Amino acid sequence: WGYGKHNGPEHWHKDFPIAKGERQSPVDIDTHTAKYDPSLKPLSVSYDQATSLRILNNGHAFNVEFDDSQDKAVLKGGPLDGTYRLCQFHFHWGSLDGQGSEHTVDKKKYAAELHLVHWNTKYGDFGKAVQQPDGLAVLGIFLKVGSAKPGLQKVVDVLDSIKTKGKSADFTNFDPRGLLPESLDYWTYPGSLTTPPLLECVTWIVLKEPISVSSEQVLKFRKLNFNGEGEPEELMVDNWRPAQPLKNRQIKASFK
Ligand SMILES: [Zn+2]
């Protein structure tokens, strides 16, 4: 599977038939049909103790991986009834600034989208968690182009070293607090992973406020490769799945 004409999102259902299921992600957030829920609690993001390990080009994005052996980087509160440990974060982006996000807002696309991926500590480990409808919580954050995000620069600065599929670099001492906007206002709905295996295991929490990144910062994403070293160059752009049908799920918001 991939993001090409012959292996892209419109093909995934042939190997992963849940691609046409009832709680697929991403979705468009229609701000008129999304429901303000005053009962929605503030989100608790506790990343003070977050321990980054490595950054790697897995052939469809880059992932920063964390030590999730303890409650060092946990998401709780908001719509969640449990505690969720950060395993990895990655982004999706476009071939130009006008597209790249997975979620949309009133069908508007952003230049990129950051996903911080967390698993439910009821379930022992990540691989057990994804078998459960409440196994993961993904915090999604839109990227728009403007001022530079200082907290992203260490990520931008290492990407030249992981250009091709299978490359990795040590990536210690990275603090993901540097990737958060000021507000934790959010939309939330039940959904899925946005890549195969497309499991319907995710509580999605999508922040209202985008982070601003510079032109130069998002451009660096577009120099990565889907291919391995020595193989014909396939630039890693447009690694986003389009919005999928909401199918009567309720998107709730912490604001009107
Ligand atoms: Zn993602």
Domain CATH number, residue 236:
3.10.200.10
Q: Is 92 annotated as a binding residue?
A: yes
Which one-letter amino acid corresponds to residue 212? S
Which residues form the domain of 55? Answer: 12-253
* Domain contains 80: yes
- Backbone phi, psi, residue 216, to 5°: -60, -40
CA dihedral 191, 195, 199, 204 (to 10 degrees): -20
195 in a known ligand binding site? yes
Is residue 6 one of the residues assigned to a domain? no
Report the number of distinct structural domains present in the chain. 1
User: Is residue 7, in this structure, part of any structural domain at all?
Assistant: no
Method: X-ray
Q: How many angstroms does the Cα of residue 205 sit away from the middle of ligand 1? A: 12
* Discontinuities in the chain (C→N > 2.5 Å), after residue: none
CA neighbor of 83 nearest in space, from 43, 113, 24, 39: 43
Residue 64 belongs to a domain: yes
User: Is residue 221 situated within a structural domain?
Assistant: yes
Question: Is residue 4 domain-resident?
Answer: no
Measure 140 CA to ligand 1 centroid, in angstroms: 8
**Around Cβ 64, how many Cβ atoms within 10 Å?**
23
In a domain, 120, yes or no: yes
Query: In this structure, which residues have their CB less than 5 angstroms from ion ligand 1?
Result: 115
To one decimal, the resolution in angstroms is 1.0
- The answer to whether 13 is a known catalytic residue is no
Question: 107's torsion region: left (phi>0), alpha (psi -120 to 50) or beta?
Answer: left
Residues with Cβ < 8 Å from 227, sequence gap 6 or more? 164, 165, 233, 234
- DSSP class of 81: S
In a domain, 5, yes or no: no
